[PDB]
Amino acid sequence: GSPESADLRALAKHLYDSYIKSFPLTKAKARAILTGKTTDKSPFVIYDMNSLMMGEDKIKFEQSKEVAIRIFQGCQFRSVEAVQEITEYAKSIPGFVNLDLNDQVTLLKYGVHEIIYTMLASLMNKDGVLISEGQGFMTREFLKSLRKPFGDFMEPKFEFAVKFNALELDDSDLAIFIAVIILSGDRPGLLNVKPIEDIQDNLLQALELQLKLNHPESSQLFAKLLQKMTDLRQIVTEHVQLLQVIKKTETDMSLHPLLQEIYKD
């Protein structure tokens, strides 16, 4: 009834406010930069090797390693930063910090990359990706051009992003969507699934009401977002497969200890 609905809107707002606190660059700010509607300094565009060299100081997060490997390493540190932000966000979801601590770890271990790819879409258009909190823009063609197989990592994320961004979700919608994904009761090795699904069920009701109110003309948007959750799991599976290739092909790659924990399978 209306009392439940009001509580769902208060939960949606709490999540939005926590999302704003956790993530430095929101979708609204990212899209303004991408569409060129900001007053702030323009991102440095990296579209070829010359511009990467020039722009390197603008986009920094010494270097004799080959460029594809250097981009690979830099990406880990950005990914590790994202894990930290997502963990802060998860701790703001009501009920999360009261879960068994090993289950909180499990939820982050198996959920964080699905969230990374969701939030990465906010930074992407069909032509490239905003990097370094808006200070750079690396073209999709440049990343595709990196020597095999490094040029294969980002393209499926761009493919996901263009379709995902066509749904026109805003930061308020995204805050609930990512909370739903974190609270997935089917992650391997969860010790107590029922409290997780109880939280998720309430988040799913908050998401459905959010979409009905914020996107009244977008038919079955909720069903579309449930399908995107499945699509994100496929992106993760494919990314892991590519990592296995690099591990078998490339000689001495240093994997960050936080990613070592996450990818310990």
Binding site: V97, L101, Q104, V105, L108, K109, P257, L258, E261
Partner: peptide, 11 residues
């Protein structure tokens, strides 16, 4: 030895 657990426990 869990880095995720350390992140979760920091207020």
């Amino acid at each position: 030895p869990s880095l995720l657990k350390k992140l979760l426990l920091a207020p």
